[PDB]
């Protein structure tokens, strides 16, 4: 679920 945490920024 980190894929998004890295995509957002």
Q: Write b or e for each residue in 1-9: b if 16 or more Cβ atoms lie within 10 A of its Cβ, otherwise e.
A: eeeeeeeee
Structure-determination technique: NMR
In the chain, alpha helices (H): 2-8
Question: Scanning the structure block, which residue is given the tokens 């945490």?
Answer: 5
Q: Tell me the backbone φ, ψ of residue 6, rounded to 5 degrees.
A: -90, -30
Whole-angstrom distance, CA of residue 5 vs CA of residue 1: 7
Question: Scanning the structure block, which residue is given the tokens 């920024």?
Answer: 9
């Amino acid at each position: 679920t980190v894929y998004v945490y890295s995509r957002v920024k």
